[PDB]
């Protein structure tokens, strides 16, 4: 039952107000002891407690940015709202909401899947996905590796699947890297060689920030 999901901008203009929403079910924020809090994680960096609200509307903020923080709850709709004024580059992070289950100890027992927030002057750019096939002059095989090259996009995240999630095992989606102000991401899938091209291998590349979803069927080079 207990699910929390973050929703937020994705990209933000420096000095504009970051506004995050934490929808939840499986519990009620009027149950005695219950609380909801926000923790944020920059890229490859550690964890930072921002704020939280208890069942009785007692609020707490990180002093370091207390100037900028505002939290509230809609117990009726089962939602919590966080606003962070004068948003700046260093506020670029994954923002989590998590539940505090009791009055007795402040630990975080259920977390949402996160909400990637970038804040930058850079323009929301969709990806060009390119199919990666061996090429005419191939090799003996036994197993065959295909791939998709997701290039010249901003901001993160990009979400890569194969055959709409049907082809999960033997996959390697590589972390994004930022050449200029555009992210470059690759992903590989490894199939029994016999199965391709007889059975279709399609890579699915969604970039929600640019409202874009690209299917790319991997087909032999021929020529």
């Amino acid at each position: 039952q207990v699910t929390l999901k973050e929703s937020g901008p994705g990209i933000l203009q420096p000095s504009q107000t970051l506004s995050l929403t934490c929808s939840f079910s499986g519990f009620s924020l009027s149950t005695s002891g219950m609380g909801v809090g926000w923790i944020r994680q920059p890229s490859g960096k550690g964890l930072e407690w921002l704020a939280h609200i208890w069942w009785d509307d007692v609020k707490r903020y990180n002093p370091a940015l207390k100037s900028r923080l505002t939290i509230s709850k809609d117990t009726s709709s089962s939602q919590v709202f966080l606003k962070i004024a004068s948003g700046d580059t260093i506020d670029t992070a994954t923002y989590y909401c998590a539940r505090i289950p009791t009055d007795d100890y402040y630990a975080l027992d259920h977390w949402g899947q996160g909400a990637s927030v970038t804040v930058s002057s850079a323009k929301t750019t969709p990806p060009s996905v390119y199919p990666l096939a061996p090429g005419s002059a191939a090799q003996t095989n036994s197993m065959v590796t295909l791939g998709c090259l997701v290039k010249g996009y901003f901001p993160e995240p990009v979400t890569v699947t194969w055959n709409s999630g049907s082809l999960s095992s033997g996959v390697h989606t590589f972390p994004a890297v930022l050449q200029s102000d555009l992210y470059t991401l690759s992903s590989s899938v490894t199939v029994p060689s016999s199965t391709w091209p007889s059975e279709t291998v399609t890579c699915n590349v969604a970039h929600p920030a640019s409202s874009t979803k690209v299917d790319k069927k991997i087909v032999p080079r021929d020529c």
């Binding site: 060009s128 199919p131 096939a133 090429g135 590796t145 090259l149 290039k151 690759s186 590989s188 080079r221």
Partner: peptide, 25 residues
């Protein structure tokens, strides 16, 4: 490692880019 090399796509060459990828798996 299992090493797999790929030439630039026809689609990418059209935009005027050339990316040779190498997977070590």
């Amino acid at each position: 490692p299992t090493v797999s090399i790929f030439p630039p796509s026809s689609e990418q060459l059209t935009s005027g880019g050339a990316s040779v990828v190498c997977f070590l798996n």
